[PDB]
Amino acid sequence: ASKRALVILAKGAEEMETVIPVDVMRRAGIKVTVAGLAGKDPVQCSRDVVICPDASLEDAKKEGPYDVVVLPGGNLGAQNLSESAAVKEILKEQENRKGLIAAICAGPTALLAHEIGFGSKVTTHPLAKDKMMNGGHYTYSENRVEKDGLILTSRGPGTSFEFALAIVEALNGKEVAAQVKAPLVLK
Amino acid sequence: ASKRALVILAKGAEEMETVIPVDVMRRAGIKVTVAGLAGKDPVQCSRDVVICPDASLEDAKKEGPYDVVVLPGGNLGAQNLSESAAVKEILKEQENRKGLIAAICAGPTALLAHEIGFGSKVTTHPLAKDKMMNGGHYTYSENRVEKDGLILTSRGPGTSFEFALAIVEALNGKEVAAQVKAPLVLK
Ligand SMILES: [Cu+]
């Protein structure tokens, strides 16, 4: 059975941080659902790329559980994620069931908002560090990708491939990740 | 006056190779038009990401000229570009006016189809080399990004940032490219 990923797409999401993980997980044979936070309508990303989600979050959440929940960054996207009761509920359930949560750039600040994974070692975009660290609930890392158990974080558009391949490795193993990586022409 | 980019988006385009350049050029203050080859409707990319273009190609082409025309890759997307009379006309006019043409991954094979830039040093995705080189009309390079005058080519999803920042450098200069690069958390 293929593994399953939920990507939560909100207005203001960073489009590279959304599309790179979706594409790479699909290359890995993961069944990815791109879910619109606000509904099934098209989502205007931070740099004005318009993406049509596969489903509303309302619907996608009924189709769980997922092997990973993925939170893209973008300052405004992450704020929308942080404000969402539905996201809170999804992340709490994912944490409760010992499932992976992956967040990139400003995305990890939604973990803080929802009180998820406290005590974890995390990274964020440099400009999001002070927000993530408010209260000292996490330990900060400058690694490009940080994985502390079931909390996987990364720093920015330029770490998106590394982030996505870490999700692939966690779900499908090192060999699948290496196989997916080669045709990408990385490094 | 800001510089202007035309990105031609066809069914089967590689979505990372489309979104990374769009986003990065917009960070550089370039006015980017995402134009749908087939019309204004949403475009299903190679890994099933659905992008809504800003305009049809039919319309966007009336709003020229552009400082760069950008061809994403994806094997099927590039085939659609290669088959298009409208693309032929756009590229011929761009070449005639000494404007930049940028193509990534299988994208450069549309240059061959349209007889554009013969004699140039080019790169492609490794799996697209034999198609690009049919007839020996170009000289092949393994550089991640190859720029021979007004023909700028690159290799794959993993070279998309480098490709996009080379377009930024060509249009807006080295300093703008460096400024845009830093917040991306590359390398
Ligand atoms: Cu759309």
Written as six digits, the tokens of B61 are: 């082409």
Q: In this structure, is the dihedral angle defined by the CA atoms of residues B187, B127, B18 and B102, taken in order, positive or negative? A: positive
Partner residue facing B52 (CB), from A20, A42, A158: A42
Q: What are the C-alpha distances in Å from B74 to residues A9, A11, A29, A145, B110?
A: 24, 27, 18, 27, 11
Q: List, in order, residues 6 or more apart from A81 with CB less than 8 Å away.
A: A8, A10, A37, A71, A87, A107, A110, A113
* Contact call for residues B132 and B122 (beta carbons, < 8 A): yes
CB contact under 8 Å between A52 and B48, yes or no, is no
A44 by DSSP, 3-state: which? strand
Exposed (0-12), middle (13-18) or buried (19+): which is B99, by Cβ within 10 Å?
middle
Q: List, in order, residues 6 or more apart from B11 with CB less than 8 Å away.
A: B37, B38, B43, B44, B45, B76, B77, B80
* Contact call for residues B44 and A48 (beta carbons, < 8 A): no
A66 by DSSP, 3-state: which? coil
CB contact under 8 Å between A23 and B15, yes or no, is yes
* Residue A91 burial (CB count, 10 A): 25
* Contact call for residues B183 and B175 (beta carbons, < 8 A): no
As a whole number of angstroms, the distance between CA A108 and CA A128 comes to 9
* Residue A108 burial (CB count, 10 A): 33
Q: Using H for helix, E for strand and C for coil, what is the string for A91-159?
A: HHHHHHCCCEEEEECCCHHHHHHCCCCCCCEECCCHHHHHHHCCCCCCEECCCCEEEECCEEEECCHHH
* Contact call for residues B5 and B25 (beta carbons, < 8 A): yes
Q: What is the layout of strands, in order, in the sheet containing A31-36?
A: A55-56, A31-36, A4-9, A68-71, A100-104, A151-154, A145-148
- Give helix A160-172 / helix A174-181 axis angle, nearest 10°: 140
Tell me how far the alpha carbon of residue A2 lies from the centroid of ligand 1, in angstroms. Answer: 27
CB contact under 8 Å between A184 and B157, yes or no, is yes
Kindly report the nearest CA distance between residue A21 and chain B, in angstroms.
9
Using the Cβ of B182 and the Cβ atoms of chain A, whether some distance falls under 8 Å is answered with no
Written as six digits, the tokens of B1 are: 């006056």
CB contact under 8 Å between A144 and B185, yes or no, is yes
Partner residue facing A15 (CB), from B23, B159, B184: B23
Using the Cβ of A168 and the Cβ atoms of chain B, whether some distance falls under 8 Å is answered with no
Q: Using H for helix, E for strand and C for coil, what is the string for chain B?
A: CCCEEEEEECCCCCHHHHHHHHHHHHHCCCEEEEEECCCCCCEECCCCCEEECCEEHHHHHHHCCCCEEEECCCHHHHHHHHHCHHHHHHHHHHHHCCCEEEEECCCHHHHHHCCCCCCCEECCCHHHHHHHCCCCCCEECCCCEEEECCEEEECCHHHHHHHHHHHHHHHHCHHHHHHHHHHHCCC
Q: What are the C-alpha distances in Å from B79 to residues A21, A101, A136, B51, B152?
A: 25, 38, 53, 19, 19
* Residue B136 burial (CB count, 10 A): 8
The answer to whether the peptide bond before residue B65 is cis (omega within 30 degrees of 0) is yes
Q: Which of B158, B41, B60 is nearest to A183 (CA)?
A: B158
Q: Which of B3, B2, B72 is nearest to B34 (CA)?
A: B72
As a whole number of angstroms, the distance between CA B1 and CA A163 comes to 37
Q: ∠ CA A132-A134-A135 to the nearest 5 degrees?
A: 125
Q: In this structure, is the dihedral angle defined by the CA atoms of residues A72, B49, A147 and B180, taken in order, positive or negative? A: negative
User: What is the structure's resolution, reported in angstroms to one decimal?
Assistant: 1.4
CB contact under 8 Å between A158 and B127, yes or no, is no
Q: List, in order, residues 6 or more apart from B105 with CB less than 8 Å away.
A: B14, B17, B72, B73, B74, B78, B124, B125, B128, B154, B155, B156, B157
Return residues 101-160 of B near A (CB < 8 Å): 125-127, 144, 155-159
CB contact under 8 Å between A15 and B27, yes or no, is no
Name the residue type at position B118. F
As a whole number of angstroms, the distance between CA B160 and CA B94 comes to 22
Q: What are the C-alpha distances in Å from B22 to residues A147, A184, B187?
A: 30, 19, 20
Using the Cβ of A31 and the Cβ atoms of chain B, whether some distance falls under 8 Å is answered with no
Q: List, in order, residues 6 or more apart from A85 with CB less than 8 Å away.
A: none
Q: What are the C-alpha distances in Å from A27 to residues A64, A96, B50?
A: 21, 28, 16
Dihedral, CA atoms, A78, A82, A86, A87, nearest 10 degrees?
60
The catalytic residues of B are 105, 125
Residue with tokens 């010992």: A98
* Contact call for residues A73 and A104 (beta carbons, < 8 A): yes
Written as six digits, the tokens of A72 are: 């893209």
* Residue B184 burial (CB count, 10 A): 22
The catalytic residues of A are 105, 125
Task: Provide the terminal-to-terminal Cα distance of chain B, rounded to the nearest Å.
Answer: 32
Q: Which of B19, B86, B94 is nearest to B52 (CA)?
A: B19
Partner residue facing A185 (CB), from B22, B51, B159: B159
As a whole number of angstroms, the distance between CA A5 and CA A21 comes to 10
- Which domains are present in chain A? 1-187 (3.40.50.880)
As a whole number of angstroms, the distance between CA B91 and CA B152 comes to 13
* Contact call for residues A124 and A153 (beta carbons, < 8 A): yes
